[PDB]
Amino acid sequence: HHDPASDEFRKEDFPFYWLARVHGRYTQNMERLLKKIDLDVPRWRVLWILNENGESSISEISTHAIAKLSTITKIVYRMKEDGLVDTAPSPEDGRVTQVRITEVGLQNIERMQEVTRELFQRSFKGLTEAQVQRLNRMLEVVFHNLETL
Amino acid sequence: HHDPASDEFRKEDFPFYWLARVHGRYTQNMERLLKKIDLDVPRWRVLWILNENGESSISEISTHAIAKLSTITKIVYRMKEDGLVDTAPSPEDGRVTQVRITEVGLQNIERMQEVTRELFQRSFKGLTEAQVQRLNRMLEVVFHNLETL
Ligand SMILES: O=C(O)Cc1c[nH]c2ccccc12
Ligand SMILES: O=C(O)Cc1c[nH]c2ccccc12
């Protein structure tokens, strides 16, 4: 039922169908919420990456934000204009740009934590903490499977 | 660990992080494969929707392909030029465009079934049929949860 090469294929039994539907609805709702505090999904991701990893290159940010280097560069310098991040040439390689979050960026993290609280309360309604962890593990397994292609 | 409002938040424990990573890697690999037979992810989706549901409006296609009505309209008339679909005004409402798959579209379905076979063999490696069904059910639950916002 979940095999596109089968005659029994049904999108409603196809994990990637519901994955894409979830990605789209989640993205739309997050864009709506973050707009209220002058943010968006790419800047939400960049801020979380900087908050977890400290100083980060454009390349590392791009990997974890799922965006092109050009997109991340534009977003990063926009955030720097707004005061949310600062940048500096990497000492190892002047070609490589290092980005770090500012105290204003951290305040923006607090704002995005508050404004999305209800969405994340609702998102996993009906699922236990073990079920959520199992969802997470299975998604990571699929990701690693796709990295072998 | 999976709660963005928590001090313990870690993206690697956050279902939406792995969901987005999977969506991106899956999309890139599918684009690569479908390009070999002159297709892409949006046309793969449109063909599956038409193959399952028969004659379908632009709106229904757009819902299930996760795209804007304008995007789907352009894709649909491109596919019609290439002979993969045909269109007709809906009898109920001349404003509404009905799309149906052609025998050439069905042949393209067979080609996309063949060219992605290995990706789908690899995608669920290490997961049993029950685990895949549980992944599917949990994703549908999250989707329905997000529809309440
Ligand atoms: O791109 C994918 O394979 C997932 C997907 C999203 N909408 C779809 C409609 C029909 C079949 C698959 C999909
Ligand atoms: O948009 C999301 O919430 C998922 C996501 C993708 N990359 C991320 C990096 C850090 C935190 C969340 C995400």
Author numbering:
A (entry chain A), B (entry chain A): 19 to 167
What does the paper say about this structure?
MarR proteins were produced from three iad and three iac loci and their binding affinities for IAA were measured. Crystal structures for the IAA-binding IacR MarRs from P. putida, E. soli and A. baumannii and IadR MarR from B. japonicum were determined and refined to 1.5–2.8 Å resolution. The contacts between MarR and IAA ligand are typified for the iadR group by MarR_73 and the iacR group by P. putida 1290 MarR_iacR. Further, by examining the binding of MarR-family regulators from both locus types and solving crystal structures for five of these MarRs, we demonstrated that IadR MarRs (for example, Variovorax MarR_73) have stronger binding affinity for IAA than their iac-like counterparts, probably caused by optimized coordination of the IAA carboxyl group in their MarR binding pocket.
We characterize the binding of IAA to MarR-family regulators from both iac and iad loci.
